[PDB]
């Protein structure tokens, strides 16, 4: 869990996520944003056997979840490695969720005050309000997400199935049509994703490996790893790697941005034409 970037959401309301409020040190419980305001790096300390929870805020990069003793308020404060900035991550095996207990006083644990939309420090109990879902942020963002996929080279255009009956995949200006939207679904067993085109019921983005680099939408088929993909952030831009051959990534032909440009797979080569934005419509 060390060094992992996660989202943290509430068992009591799974639509509410820990959110670092811009402009101040506040932490709120907020709807899912799929951005850095709801991402936290888990940092393990060997001496304490406890963790810091550090905001991925790009403007102030060293804020950590902090109990503002002697109050019961929780905010994001500059990291000084203080005891009130360390937490025990206790996984309830009977609920598959976490209790997050203060290292400074482990009798007190995070409590989701869903009415106040913030966190307080509390005693333990059997309520869902002290239980949290900690998930890798890419899985959190993309495990069940209807999206548009755009090349970083042309933000106003999208990867699309050509039409309901033409299963080729190309680039075209965004028009909010069904064939231009995809539902990403994470498969836990395979630890990979499928992209279901919204104009079909069972059509997924597929590498047609029998035809070179071709990508088409095809019916989801039991045993075809070419229909699964890995989504990796670029060291919110992503490469999209095929599971059948992880040297092959989704590729905008020649970095061309004209309407009709081919979407395919290609050898991974670090080009801007292999980097993608994945966004809400």
Ligand X SMILES: OC[C@H]1O[C@@H](O[C@H]2[C@H](O)[C@@H](O)[C@@H](O)O[C@@H]2CO)[C@H](O)[C@@H](O)[C@H]1O
Residue ranges that bind ligand X, judged by CB under 6 A: 251, 253-254, 266, 269, 271, 273
From the CB of 218, what's the least distance to ligand X, in Å?
21
Token look-up 């032909």 returns 253
In the bound state, the residue with its beta carbon closest to ligand X is 254
Nearer to ligand X, 38 or 251 (CB): 251
| Residues 76/64, Cβ–Cβ less than 8 Å | yes
C-alpha 40/C-alpha 37 separation (Å) is: 8
Please give the structure tokens belonging to residue 139: 């899985």
> Which residue lies nearer to ligand X by CB, 197 or 239?
239
Closest to ligand X by CB, 28 vs 262, is: 262
**Who's near 3: CB < 8 A, 6+ residues apart?**
41, 42, 43, 44
Nearer to ligand X, 26 or 277 (CB): 277
| CA–CA dist 195, 216 (Å, integer) | 11
Cis (ω within 30 of 0) for the bond into 129?
no
Tell me the closest approach of the beta carbon of residue 225 to ligand X, in angstroms. 22
CB of 109 to ligand X, least distance (A): 50
Is the separation of the CB atoms in 146 and 198 below 8 Å?
yes
Q: Is 217 exposed, middle or buried (0-12, 13-18, 19+ CB in 10 A)?
A: buried
What's the min distance (Å) between Cβ of 235 and ligand X?
18
Give residue 29's Cα distance to chain centre.
17
* Nearest distance in Å: CB 245, ligand X: 15
Between 183 and 262, CB nearer to ligand X: 262
169 Rama sector, left if φ>0, alpha if ψ -120 to 50, beta otherwise: beta
Query: Is the CB of residue 195 less than 8 Å from the CB of residue 187?
Result: no
Residues ≥6 apart with Cβ < 8 Å to 139: 186
Peptide bond into 70 cis (omega under 30): yes
Minimum gap (Å) between residue 256 Cβ and ligand X: 8
Least distance in angstroms from the C-beta of 273 to ligand X: 5
Considering beta carbons, is residue 233 or 254 the nearer one to ligand X? 254
């Amino acid at each position: 869990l060390n060094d992992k970037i996660v989202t943290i959401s509430c068992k009591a309301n799974t639509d509410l996520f820990f959110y670092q409020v811009p402009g101040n040190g506040n932490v709120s419980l907020f709807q899912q944003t799929r951005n850095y305001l709801e991402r936290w790096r888990i940092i393990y300390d060997s001496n304490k056997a406890a963790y810091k929870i550090k905001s991925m805020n790009i403007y102030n990069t060293n804020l950590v979840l902090t109990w503002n003793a002697p109050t019961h308020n929780i905010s994001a404060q500059q990291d000084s490695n203080a005891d009130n900035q360390y937490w025990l991550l206790l996984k309830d095996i009977g609920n598959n969720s976490f209790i997050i207990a203060s290292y400074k006083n482990p009798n007190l644990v995070l409590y989701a005050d869903t009415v106040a939309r913030n966190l307080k420090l509390s005693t333990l109990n059997n309520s869902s309000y002290i239980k949290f879902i900690i998930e890798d942020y890419v899985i959190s963002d993309f495990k069940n997400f209807t999206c548009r996929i755009s090349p970083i080279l042309a933000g106003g255009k999208v990867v699309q199935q050509v039409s309901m009956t033409n299963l080729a995949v190309n680039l075209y200006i965004w028009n909010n049509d069904l064939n231009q939207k995809w539902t990403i679904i994470y498969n836990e067993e395979k630890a990979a994703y499928q992209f279901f085109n919204k104009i079909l019921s069972n059509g997924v983005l597929t590498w047609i490996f029998s035809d070179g680099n071709t990508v088409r939408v095809s019916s989801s088929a039991q045993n075809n790893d070419a229909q699964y993909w890995l989504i990796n952030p670029v060291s919110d831009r992503y490469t999209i790697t095929n599971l059948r051959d992880k040297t092959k990534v989704l590729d905008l032909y020649g970095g061309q941005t004209a309407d009709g440009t081919t979407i395919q797979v290609f050898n991974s080569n670090g080009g801007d034409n292999q980097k993608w934005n994945i966004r809400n419509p």
